[PDB]
Homo-oligomer: A and B are copies of this chain.
């Protein structure tokens, strides 16, 4: 009996009944203790003696034994205890070896990480994926991971080790073909990794989430090829209320916070600092196996960001046998800025980027039904490479309403690069254009329409302050076709502008182009006393349907017409009034209109 009690079965001989309640189960202490489980229950030598964790102990095999055992009972939650750091010092074996895996996750087995998990220097200059939910080296032959949650106040620390080679991959949690899996509360820090968390695999998975996590300093070297903190690769999944921070120079050029790569995915309520990019919103044809060829219902909302490159990047692409499509996207309520940097010192600053594929192709995309609304964007005045939208690949539609954009360009694409085919670009008059870059725009077009063609598009320019440095508010080169479009420039703050809208190929003459913009025009009247015609001296107004005065008349003896039409020879003409006769000659600011 003494022997039984001191034995490992002792607690199984000590009776217990909850709160002395006579209606409660007559149990043994061991039954109640068996209701919970921790790493300490597996962190022992072959004789069953507990092993203290530390920098010289590899905890991997013990944590794997705990997970495997709990898995065998239909699941539960293993605690990783507070007040200790648990080092990992070797790779795992079996199915996860193909993924450079350390720990293998299993279905229904949750991890409550309250202490710290820290990679030992065995992993320096090596690939690794700390937690892996695949059960096979080939993800295509992998089983699923279901009902696996990682949560707590603890920490995953990547030991500060740099990558050994750019081709290597490193990850924190790869859930795999993951259904109802989540990470909540955890801080991931101090590394050089590719991703912190990945959700799903090529569309297989569902209901995976990352909530209230922190990601701190996860890129640190020039070796690191690329980094996206959370890659969402299964539908009905997302990231909310997270914090992302980088301090490395390299992060400003390579790091993105989130990738939304399947339908019905979201990125909300998060704060980003020190990253190149905010989010990719993409349908890769190569990733279309699990959930189809369409990324739709994509939501980026209510985030706060300081970045160095582009906030949201839109794209879709193709393989030999699959074509990716991106549609039904909303980007709203975000407040974003380009951090303090030299012009051209990081990838081109943008709120929205329509990005060419990984091979640089701009003629594979199928991006449409995007709404960008109620966001703020700001870039410091020196950052020439800042745009509301860098439209660098084919676009089948994007709508901008009620944003506030305060940067160098509104619409931009580099000339002599790609020549995008643009459809259904809508820029509503309710987009407010800020003045931070006023006086910086010598030689530049606010809306620089460097495309192959534009159709079914609306650009309603409204200034809110003067910028007389700019070459034009909007310019179309002669190589850009323009049809079935509406282009207007409001006259406010434009009286002293030489050029307002510029159509280098006279594209505003098109049958279904509807335009209006201010221009200065010289007119000369006949000498007749009374009602008298005034005609423009130049003949380039054959496209104008009406025009009206934007200038006061300093004269007593006559007045020019208030309104004008045109004539077949391209003159404007209207009827004014000579109180006394005489040939008149005036220079007037007019609002030129065509079909509006």
Contacts and interface: CB of A to CB of B under 8 A. Distances in A.
A553 B531 contact: no
A9 B15 contact: yes
A274 to B, nearest CB: 12
Nearest to A151: B153
Interface in A111-158: 114, 147, 149, 153
B575 A567 contact: no
Contact of A38 (B21, B35, B269): B35
A268 B269 contact: yes
A435 B424 CA distance: 9
Interface stretch (A295-303, A343-351, A439-447): A295-303
Contacts of A371: 335, 374, 376, 404
A241 interface: yes
A330 interface: yes
Sorted nearest first, the 3 A-B pairs with minimum C-beta distance are A26-B48, A74-B83, A8-B17
A478 interface: no
A559 B552 contact: no
Given A14-B5, A374-B402, A546 B548 contact: yes
Interface in A508-524: 512, 514
A286 to B, nearest CB: 25
Interface in A242-263: 243, 245
A553 B533 contact: no
A221 interface: no
Interface string A524-553: 000010111100000000111111111111
A248 B576 CA distance: 70
A251 to B, nearest CB: 16
A37 to B, nearest CB: 6
Interface stretch (A275-283, A386-394, A487-495): A487-495
Interface stretch (A87-95, A353-361, A458-466): A458-466
Copies in the complex: 3
Contacts of A595: 491-492, 495, 550-551, 589
A573 interface: yes
Contact of A25 (B42, B82, B108): B42
Given A180-B187, A207-B214, A29 B11 contact: yes
B302 A297 contact: no
A335 B268 CA distance: 14
A503 interface: no
A341 interface: no
Interface in A9-25: 9-21, 23-25
A332 interface: yes
A44 B21 CA distance: 12
Contact of A8 (B16, B337, B574): B16
